[PDB]
Amino acid sequence: SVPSRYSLVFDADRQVNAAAGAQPAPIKIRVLLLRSDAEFMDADFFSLQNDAKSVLGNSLLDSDQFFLTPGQTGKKLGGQSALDARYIGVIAEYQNLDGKTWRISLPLPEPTETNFYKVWQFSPDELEAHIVAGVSGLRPVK
Incomplete structure (x- = not known):
């Protein structure tokens, strides 16, 4: 709501998601909007899937x-x-799945950090992050 929308931009390694002896294969990405990440970070793969x-x-x-x-x-x-x-x-x-970072949680800003909007009312209100689906798992880009 403040800011009102988000987006993630994804790159995938050329070698992402290739089993032993197999070619790299497209990978399914899910993006979940969460009230909290406790249950998300604790749930098993099957349950979430x-x-x-x-x-x-x-x-x-x-x-x-x-x-x-x-x-x-x-x-x-x-x-x-x-x-x-x-x-x-x-x-x-x-x-x-073994040894891969197949899940990440990204904290959205809280009240403090989006305070600038009451004064800077016309600033862009889309948060953007960049994620790579790499051979070893997902990682945010600096």
């Missing part, structure tokens, strides 16, 4: 998804935030 709302309950505000092709750069997904949104959760459904 098969029924996120059940395992997350009231903590899940919204969710969206897309596929990312190995080597693809600058693929953007965004949506509207909500007043009580505190985190964006990101899940990457790697075929070989």
Whole structure:
């Protein structure tokens, strides 16, 4: 709500998501709007994949998804935030889950940090982050 929307721009490594002996394969990315990330960071992969709302309950505000092709750069997904949104959760459904960072939680700013809007009323109100789906997992870019 303040700011009102968000977006994530995704790059995927050319070698992302290639099993032993197999070619790199598109990977499913989910983006979840969250009231809190506690249940999200604790839930097991299957639970989140098969029924996120059940395992997350009231903590899940919204969710969206897309596929990312190995080597693809600058693929953007965004949506509207909500007043009580505190985190964006990101899940990457790697075929070989072991040792991969297949989930990340990104904290949204709190009241303090978006204070500038009452005075700077016309500043852009879309938060943007950049994520890479890498061979070892998801990581934000500096």
